């Protein structure tokens, strides 16, 4: 019944709703991604700070899709739930029919696929969501980081940031992550990801969540103590 | 008698040529003049374009 | 303290001496004046007598006649005679006629208007640049096109080419646009005209076009000048009915705004300064660069610029060692400069309610909670969509 | 032609916001107030009706408190009609899980599925968003007592306390002071009446403008009990905190 | 209504009679003070009582052109109302902008009544030395301050 | 809102005029077809030094003798590449034979036509768009190397050479002088880079350019990023002899 | 032919509340009066009869009806939307309690079935 | 013949437009070759845009 | 603090005490025009000032009755007669005349209509834009010279052919190409009276108020021989033919109809050349753009890539520049750019020479300057919308 066209072309060569899509993303939360040479690190800041608000049962903004894929999302949070759902569905129907877990390349197309296909039908608004997709290719060591648009475009990155105040942290990353020399270890990368967030978080360790995915389905989160430790370290050094 | 249609058909050109040629006294009037900014000077211009014409 | 009073006494020994000297030499010391000034005043006064009837000149004839119209009504075909220059005679001008035989005995009449009062300004702002300090390089583009060709004629003859014209101010609100303008008019000390863009829409129809042709004839006269059209966005919504606004009134204002600033007219020096927060409604015949040269783009400042900004406002307030100036800046995460200014007006409003006359660390951390609650109560998103 | 008549609920604004959704968040704050309080020893679910007339049969009515299944109760804020749809759709989904796993639905699951339904109305199909928000109060083995709230956007978050309906900011600051993490069930009851007796727009807080229900693990042999109190036991604890 | 009487005697009378109190503190002098609430609560009758003790000329402005005869409309009157109220300082200009005339003008433009109060506001915030010595107060009144144009 | 349905009383479907703008926004894509090897080269327009150059794909394989380069929004194109891939393989099940190059263009052009109101049960699975061009290049026995230009109009022509994208106007005027009928593969490959250098925003490098051909023996083959760096280096020697 | 009110005709006001719901009550307030008093051992419901002429005999029209043998019902507001609403009610009472429990529904349950119709007459376009 | 849907005002706009072409060359007589060529110079036509799909 | 508080109270009283005594004394002190030659004028002008030469109460004739009927401008009607020796041809219909102050009798007739005066302030006095100022050597600039300049300087060549010379010409296009830059140029060179009008000057609330104006302007241009009447910005009062059925388009369409009936005229126009500078031919009216009044219409084009290489020679030769700035090099780099934006690269390299502290603008300050003005003034498409068709 409803199929009224929402991709009214802009005479200036655009589409009004796909600009607006990009705008809604900017409103929402921030999240940063950086790829060492043997790890990926997804940090995101959490406005779930608010005395008397749990974090045990409240869902974190970094989601598990598969054993060795992880997603982080900025933009409308009602909407995030869908793209998780679809991707999970996918991940199993790939094992079923072709065997072997999803190549991180593939799953990127597939999430990207879904967001494009909401601009085609009239009955539906675009998802105002951009995402970071990360994982390690089956039985390999190749870090991969991918980010998609609510346009539907996708590309791999050395590190990227989406959400609010992405310009501050991109400008920070140009100077401080060399393109020829990734951070060597897991601790050196993590120190680098904290230092990027602590520009727009305005200190605190309670705010930020840091999850690391390594090769061989190692999805681990750093707990409050660890966060604090790293922060403090960056405090002494910086002060000195 | 009214003359209407597309522009270029010489509506204004013919009428003039044939009303001066037949020696019938041809008064020149343009409607935008009957519009006025005084209150009641347009009603006094129509009766005066008429009173001249009865003589 | 002493600096100010030495100079103020120095100008009240100048004013006193000059007034006594200049009064005594108009009423006692007459030698280059005397005979020759007593004869000239006696001849002009006797010849035209009084009362003198002011008239208005509709038109001149070059054989020394004029058609003047009294403002009462009865018209007159008067003569141009004796003790008159034809350099100032011209349409609209006020002449003196002799109340019997009306001959133009001279022109000296210019009678100020309450329509030239609203346009012209008497002000002299009590802030000058570096009370705007921060966003430092945004007033150092408005000084390259307003101040700098008046001050150094040398540099713009040395490169050649025509000089810049105008600027538009647009961008985030709370970025100081209104005080930025109030500073480039105080530095130069050129004749600063000032009009809001919302007076150009009036209930009266077609009165728009007459009002801004007036504004530019006043401006051309006093040139060099700066015109502030503050809020030219306002012309986009303000309307009283649908024909006192609508396509009709908005096209009349465009057309007018287009002629004043660039037309056949071959305008003298009007620099134009516009304050605005709508760039995507303006005429595309103005943000045509080459009327208006460098446009200025303003955004929310960053954390080190907001350290320069909070230091201008906090010297006003009482100062203590307790105060934590650096931690109000850090926590704010690209928040505008209109809030920073609503927080120091809120610190002395809590201070007065107590009747404690020290502003300390406690009064500033309380005033930040009240400033973050009004803008955050108006955010009814609650659970983020 | 018909495109003119189309409201376009679906479309994004130039803010990127769904203006329709923001309106819906309004229609909650008109309706009467409901407060969630988590204790370690139980969950006190407490909400004061919006209705008030002197002819209301308080004994007969529930309208703010519904049971979902035996472990999970919701408190409703908004339009009651809208709600009633969702509340039946919940009840069927609870049961569907019970037939397939012989294991009562975990509280996270049930909330997540309600939230998905809501979202869908504002994705596509030019429907008007539901004007409703729930407090979820529920118990399982996994995490213990759990509290959640979901709003008409389709986005839910957990909590250690929360309030929906009118005077949301007022309620939230009273709780910020007073709640300590250790409370029993009986102290938790007393903080709930306290927070409702200040905010109430009507002058008196009366036993027939209140609805109170508990979920307690102080039922022996390791079993949970619900109980919605009668209007005649809420009267006995209104004199207990001295409101009368 | 005892809580309202003090709130306005604080911020209106005290930076006029004692500019020394507000200058030490540093607080930049009050501009606009919005009076709102439901009609019949005495929104206007409160500023009347403050205009009698302080000795303000209470000039109720309104959109009425019956009094205006010199320019004949108040759409462009700004300087003249100031220049009469600056002579006869102190003054309270009680700008009642109606903004309840229906959704034809109030939701179509932000009303015609706020149009005149926003031209006032921008020019009286800086004009001569009166900007932290204003003796002409900008008292606004409305049905709910929410209904006013957001930029006010 | 304009309909998709409505006519502009000039005689025109407003929407087609707006589509043909979207081509021009997107990145440069040159194609020169000779009688010895079609060369396609595009400008990637890497937008940050953080982003990895080679993940971006704008030279795309349709089958093993029809290669294709796209300009415009790369998203719109994701649907239309997949449709084209299926159809060419469908034909190879059905006649055990290379799909004609011309025929494949037609099927793409047919999907392009679709954007309709979606009246009754009829399947128009788009309501809008397809603001992208293709340089569909190929080789078959019937006609030699060919090259075809698709529009979002549903309109295509054969072309000896065609530029499209941001620098289309400039590239067009250099092509009408330089194009000839005697070009070799090795001369055409160097000539494409020279016309692509003028309208490249940035300096000609292989970290914002990608070259490809289709040649009779090889089929499709995109070049190595090492080969391309060498052809850049040889252009500047010939130019610095002059 | 083709429905092109697939979209919903009810939406929230930029001031909060649904615009048409509010209107719908003002139409109920115009209506005929009627009343209800609950007693200890019975209920009483009763309405007046408003005709056009004494030619119109109002005996034939019934404004009080039976849903089931034990549940009657009375109304105010739009005469025709009562005619169908009672029909819809009787019919879906029977297809949700007459087959699946034999007995006529308890009185709470029947009220709730009616309530589903209303809500839903606002959700569909 | 070589005109159609020209109103009389365009056609006065053709015979003058031809005798300019004669003043540009320098000729003192306007030949039958210039009246043909003035027809393309004043048609109320310059075509909105070369076709792209018609 | 206290020692200095007693000095802030004096500074306040003292600066205003001084201020009042100084402005009343200074006055205009009796300064009245005339100066040093007006003393010899006093001999001549005292025997004439007493004569009744003046006043002649200015009147206006309402009816020549084959004696004369004047109507004073006070409303009171009188029959007057000939003067000292005036010809009976002078007295014409609707002409003003001066009559003897006492017993009314025509002394001296006077020129007509006292409504001209809002039409004599629209006439400009030789602009300074010269004729080589305009860009390129286009053939389009010679078409301006073949409709206006050439038939008035030599009406010998358009008399041998026999053609009615083309009198109109329309200038239209995208902004920035100089529609007003070539209409100033042609007002300098032709030395024919140029009469600029603003088409949005006519509008008032009182209907057919712009009817009076349009009449009298049209007569004022008829009297002087060789004129050019340049109507700018006629998109207001030059709109499409429509009839809303409810608005106030009724005032607007009055001033257009009065503009129509004089142009073609009962009595054709008498050496009037017509210029129209419009932004668009797209909303312009079907009775004004219909071709006897427009004649030959030349749209001024966006300069090509050779037209910007030409224009770039006017702005870079006037700056101080090092030798060897190929004007082709900066024209390529630039995208498709008007000449009003190609003037702004000189001005942005002139403001960057001052920042860098250079006495010369070089080929380095122009390469940077291109990058800044092409980005900057390209982004954001004013409204980025427009349309309003469907
Ligand atoms: N039928 C015709 N025969 C010869 N010449 C014609 C004819 N129609 C128009 N013309 C020429 O066109 C000129 C312009 O026509 P005119 O302007 O008088 O006509 P119109 O219908 O009144 O058009 P409009 O009033 O719309 O301008 C005439 O002066 C004449 O030279
Ligand atoms: N970058 C800055 N540096 C120094 N002071 C600032 C800055 N930004 C704002 N301020 C202060 O904030 C005050 C309020 O600013 P003003 O009212 O002039 O801002 P605005 O941006 O003009 O607002 P609007 O968005 O309503 O047009 C200024 O008068 C000024 O002192
Ligand atoms: N062809 C040109 N050659 C040299 N300079 C030009 C040319 N066209 C425009 N200019 C320059 O640009 C300036 C401004 O352009 P102008 O104001 O004439 O635009 P316009 O064509 O009248 O547009 P509109 O009337 O719609 O605003 C001129 O004063 C001149 O310096
Ligand atoms: N606080 C009060 N004390 C005495 N009279 C009051 C008070 N408030 C309102 N009134 C009375 O109610 C009427 C309305 O007052 P007004 O100030 O004009 O109303 P509004 O808020 O609609 O502008 C007056 O007659 C006034 O005397
Ligand atoms: Mg005619
Ligand atoms: Mg401002
Ligand atoms: Mg009042
Ligand atoms: Mg112009």
Short mmCIF file of C-alpha atoms in Angstrom, two decimals, chain F:
data_model
loop_
_atom_site.label_atom_id
_atom_site.label_comp_id
_atom_site.label_asym_id
_atom_site.label_seq_id
_atom_site.Cartn_x
_atom_site.Cartn_y
_atom_site.Cartn_z
CA UNK F 1 6.51 16.93 -5.13
CA UNK F 2 6.84 16.16 -8.77
CA UNK F 3 5.60 12.81 -9.81
CA UNK F 4 7.65 10.26 -11.52
CA UNK F 5 4.44 10.25 -13.59
CA UNK F 6 4.13 13.94 -14.33
CA UNK F 7 5.29 15.70 -17.53
CA UNK F 8 7.02 19.14 -17.70
CA UNK F 9 4.96 20.85 -20.48
CA UNK F 10 8.21 20.97 -22.54
CA UNK F 11 7.64 17.22 -22.88
CA UNK F 12 10.10 16.02 -20.26
CA UNK F 13 10.05 13.60 -17.19
CA UNK F 14 11.64 15.84 -14.66
CA UNK F 15 13.34 12.95 -12.99
CA UNK F 16 15.63 11.98 -16.02
CA UNK F 17 17.15 15.53 -16.13
CA UNK F 18 18.08 15.20 -12.41
CA UNK F 19 19.60 11.75 -12.79
CA UNK F 20 22.08 12.90 -15.51
CA UNK F 21 23.49 15.45 -13.01
CA UNK F 22 24.59 12.65 -10.53
CA UNK F 23 26.98 11.21 -13.20
CA UNK F 24 28.83 14.44 -13.40
CA UNK F 25 29.33 14.76 -9.65
CA UNK F 26 31.00 11.34 -9.39
CA UNK F 27 34.64 10.59 -10.22
CA UNK F 28 36.30 10.71 -13.66
CA UNK F 29 36.12 7.60 -15.86
CA UNK F 30 37.83 7.51 -19.26
CA UNK F 31 37.50 4.83 -21.82
CA UNK F 32 39.29 4.68 -25.20
CA UNK F 33 38.34 1.83 -27.49
CA UNK F 34 40.86 1.01 -30.27
CA UNK F 35 41.15 -1.93 -32.59
CA UNK F 36 43.74 -3.66 -30.36
CA UNK F 37 42.68 -3.14 -26.77
CA UNK F 38 40.06 -1.29 -24.78
CA UNK F 39 41.58 0.69 -21.89
CA UNK F 40 39.52 1.81 -18.90
CA UNK F 41 40.99 4.10 -16.27
CA UNK F 42 39.25 5.84 -13.35
CA UNK F 43 40.22 8.22 -10.57
CA UNK F 44 39.62 6.66 -7.08
CA UNK F 45 39.52 9.99 -5.15
CA UNK F 46 40.83 8.57 -1.84
CA UNK F 47 39.32 11.01 0.66
CA UNK F 48 41.79 10.57 3.61
CA UNK F 49 45.33 9.22 3.99
CA UNK F 50 43.86 6.85 6.63
CA UNK F 51 41.55 5.06 4.18
CA UNK F 52 43.11 2.06 2.37
CA UNK F 53 43.37 2.66 -1.32
CA UNK F 54 42.63 -0.69 -2.69
CA UNK F 55 39.49 -1.71 -0.87
CA UNK F 56 37.64 0.89 -3.20
CA UNK F 57 36.38 -0.77 -6.36
CA UNK F 58 35.18 1.14 -9.44
CA UNK F 59 36.54 -1.19 -12.08
CA UNK F 60 34.21 -4.31 -11.80
CA UNK F 61 34.21 -7.70 -13.56
CA UNK F 62 30.90 -8.68 -15.23
CA UNK F 63 32.24 -11.87 -16.79
CA UNK F 64 35.56 -13.06 -18.39
CA UNK F 65 35.22 -10.86 -21.49
CA UNK F 66 33.01 -8.05 -20.39
CA UNK F 67 34.69 -5.65 -17.95
CA UNK F 68 32.88 -2.54 -16.67
CA UNK F 69 33.78 0.84 -14.98
CA UNK F 70 31.17 2.87 -13.13
CA UNK F 71 30.74 6.60 -12.38
CA UNK F 72 28.40 8.15 -9.89
CA UNK F 73 27.12 6.90 -6.54
CA UNK F 74 28.76 3.39 -6.23
CA UNK F 75 25.83 2.29 -4.04
CA UNK F 76 23.10 2.65 -6.77
CA UNK F 77 25.37 0.58 -8.90
CA UNK F 78 25.52 -2.42 -6.44
CA UNK F 79 22.09 -3.62 -7.55
CA UNK F 80 22.77 -3.12 -11.30
CA UNK F 81 26.10 -4.89 -11.35
CA UNK F 82 24.53 -8.02 -9.74
CA UNK F 83 21.63 -8.00 -12.27
CA UNK F 84 24.09 -7.74 -15.16
CA UNK F 85 26.32 -10.60 -13.74
CA UNK F 86 23.38 -13.01 -13.49
CA UNK F 87 22.03 -12.34 -16.98
CA UNK F 88 25.37 -12.90 -18.70
CA UNK F 89 25.87 -16.20 -16.93
CA UNK F 90 22.19 -17.17 -17.63
CA UNK F 91 22.87 -16.77 -21.35
CA UNK F 92 26.08 -18.93 -20.98
CA UNK F 93 23.97 -21.79 -19.51
CA UNK F 94 21.43 -21.26 -22.24
CA UNK F 95 23.44 -21.10 -25.44
CA UNK F 96 27.00 -22.20 -24.15
CA UNK F 97 28.34 -19.07 -25.72
CA UNK F 98 29.53 -15.57 -24.94
CA UNK F 99 26.72 -13.09 -24.45
CA UNK F 100 26.89 -10.35 -27.09
CA UNK F 101 28.26 -7.09 -25.53
CA UNK F 102 25.33 -5.01 -27.09
CA UNK F 103 22.74 -7.48 -25.70
CA UNK F 104 24.08 -7.20 -22.11
CA UNK F 105 23.80 -3.32 -22.29
CA UNK F 106 20.08 -3.73 -23.27
CA UNK F 107 19.22 -5.79 -20.18
CA UNK F 108 20.90 -3.21 -17.87
CA UNK F 109 19.03 -0.43 -19.82
CA UNK F 110 15.78 -2.38 -19.13
CA UNK F 111 16.23 -2.41 -15.44
CA UNK F 112 17.11 1.27 -15.75
CA UNK F 113 13.71 2.02 -17.28
CA UNK F 114 12.29 0.63 -14.04
CA UNK F 115 11.65 3.15 -11.36
CA UNK F 116 7.88 3.17 -11.77
CA UNK F 117 4.90 3.81 -9.57
CA UNK F 118 4.52 -0.05 -8.86
CA UNK F 119 0.81 -0.16 -9.70
CA UNK F 120 -1.15 -3.36 -9.04
CA UNK F 121 0.89 -6.59 -8.40
CA UNK F 122 3.39 -5.44 -11.18
CA UNK F 123 7.05 -5.72 -9.97
CA UNK F 124 8.99 -2.41 -10.19
CA UNK F 125 11.28 -2.96 -7.35
CA UNK F 126 12.73 0.61 -7.47
CA UNK F 127 10.80 3.84 -7.20
CA UNK F 128 13.46 6.23 -8.12
CA UNK F 129 16.84 6.26 -9.65
CA UNK F 130 19.96 4.58 -10.97
CA UNK F 131 22.06 7.64 -11.10
CA UNK F 132 25.26 6.02 -12.40
CA UNK F 133 26.78 5.42 -15.87
CA UNK F 134 28.67 2.44 -17.15
CA UNK F 135 31.35 2.08 -19.52
CA UNK F 136 30.52 -1.39 -20.57
CA UNK F 137 33.47 -2.63 -22.60
CA UNK F 138 33.87 -6.01 -24.36
CA UNK F 139 35.13 -8.12 -27.26
CA UNK F 140 33.24 -10.58 -29.38
CA UNK F 141 33.49 -12.16 -32.75
CA UNK F 142 30.65 -10.12 -34.28
CA UNK F 143 32.06 -6.68 -34.36
CA UNK F 144 35.54 -6.56 -32.85
CA UNK F 145 36.18 -4.63 -29.60
CA UNK F 146 33.21 -2.53 -28.85
CA UNK F 147 32.40 -0.02 -26.15
CA UNK F 148 28.95 1.03 -25.00
CA UNK F 149 27.66 3.92 -22.81
CA UNK F 150 24.67 3.32 -20.58
CA UNK F 151 22.62 6.12 -19.02
CA UNK F 152 20.01 6.02 -16.24
CA UNK F 153 17.63 7.16 -19.03
CA UNK F 154 17.39 3.63 -20.55
CA UNK F 155 19.35 5.04 -23.58
CA UNK F 156 22.70 3.84 -24.91
CA UNK F 157 25.05 4.53 -27.66
CA UNK F 158 28.26 2.92 -29.01
CA UNK F 159 31.24 5.32 -28.83
CA UNK F 160 34.79 5.26 -30.15
CA UNK F 161 35.74 7.00 -26.92
CA UNK F 162 33.80 8.80 -24.19
CA UNK F 163 34.69 10.54 -20.97
CA UNK F 164 32.34 10.97 -18.03
CA UNK F 165 32.33 12.45 -14.54
CA UNK F 166 33.66 15.74 -13.09
CA UNK F 167 36.26 16.59 -15.83
CA UNK F 168 34.10 15.37 -18.74
CA UNK F 169 34.02 18.64 -20.58
CA UNK F 170 37.77 19.17 -20.67
CA UNK F 171 38.50 15.54 -21.41
CA UNK F 172 36.00 15.62 -24.28
CA UNK F 173 37.78 18.44 -26.08
CA UNK F 174 41.21 16.73 -25.86
CA UNK F 175 39.67 13.50 -27.05
CA UNK F 176 38.24 15.00 -30.27
CA UNK F 177 41.82 16.06 -31.19
CA UNK F 178 43.82 13.05 -29.95
CA UNK F 179 41.58 10.09 -30.75
CA UNK F 180 42.56 8.39 -33.99
CA UNK F 181 42.06 5.16 -35.88
CA UNK F 182 45.72 4.10 -35.79
CA UNK F 183 46.27 3.89 -32.00
CA UNK F 184 48.18 0.94 -30.56
CA UNK F 185 47.49 -0.63 -27.17
CA UNK F 186 50.73 0.80 -25.86
CA UNK F 187 49.97 4.27 -27.17
CA UNK F 188 46.33 4.26 -25.95
CA UNK F 189 47.32 3.22 -22.38
CA UNK F 190 49.71 6.24 -22.12
CA UNK F 191 47.21 8.60 -23.76
CA UNK F 192 44.46 7.68 -21.25
CA UNK F 193 46.75 8.66 -18.32
CA UNK F 194 47.66 11.98 -20.05
CA UNK F 195 43.94 13.03 -20.41
CA UNK F 196 43.27 11.68 -16.86
CA UNK F 197 46.18 13.73 -15.43
CA UNK F 198 44.70 17.13 -16.53
CA UNK F 199 41.34 16.63 -14.67
CA UNK F 200 42.72 14.70 -11.75
CA UNK F 201 42.39 16.89 -8.56
CA UNK F 202 45.58 15.46 -7.22
CA UNK F 203 48.99 14.56 -8.76
CA UNK F 204 48.95 11.50 -11.07
CA UNK F 205 49.81 8.56 -8.89
CA UNK F 206 48.64 4.94 -8.58
CA UNK F 207 47.28 5.50 -5.08
CA UNK F 208 44.34 7.43 -6.64
CA UNK F 209 44.22 5.72 -10.13
CA UNK F 210 43.40 2.32 -11.44
CA UNK F 211 43.91 1.08 -14.93
CA UNK F 212 42.46 -1.87 -16.80
CA UNK F 213 42.01 -3.32 -20.29
CA UNK F 214 40.30 -6.13 -22.07
CA UNK F 215 42.50 -7.72 -24.75
CA UNK F 216 41.54 -10.73 -26.97
CA UNK F 217 43.88 -13.38 -25.41
CA UNK F 218 43.68 -12.26 -21.78
CA UNK F 219 40.12 -11.27 -21.54
CA UNK F 220 39.51 -8.97 -18.66
CA UNK F 221 42.48 -8.18 -16.67
CA UNK F 222 42.94 -5.31 -14.29
CA UNK F 223 46.71 -4.19 -14.22
CA UNK F 224 49.04 -4.68 -11.27
CA UNK F 225 49.60 -1.55 -9.10
CA UNK F 226 53.29 -2.15 -9.90
CA UNK F 227 52.80 -1.99 -13.66
CA UNK F 228 50.82 1.25 -13.35
CA UNK F 229 53.54 2.97 -11.33
CA UNK F 230 55.90 2.21 -14.20
CA UNK F 231 53.61 3.65 -16.95
CA UNK F 232 53.27 6.84 -14.90
CA UNK F 233 57.10 7.05 -14.89
CA UNK F 234 57.42 6.62 -18.62
CA UNK F 235 54.87 9.35 -19.55
CA UNK F 236 57.09 11.99 -17.83
CA UNK F 237 60.15 10.91 -19.80
CA UNK F 238 58.48 11.37 -23.19
CA UNK F 239 57.08 14.68 -22.00
CA UNK F 240 60.43 15.83 -20.76
CA UNK F 241 62.03 15.05 -24.14
CA UNK F 242 59.66 17.82 -25.50
#
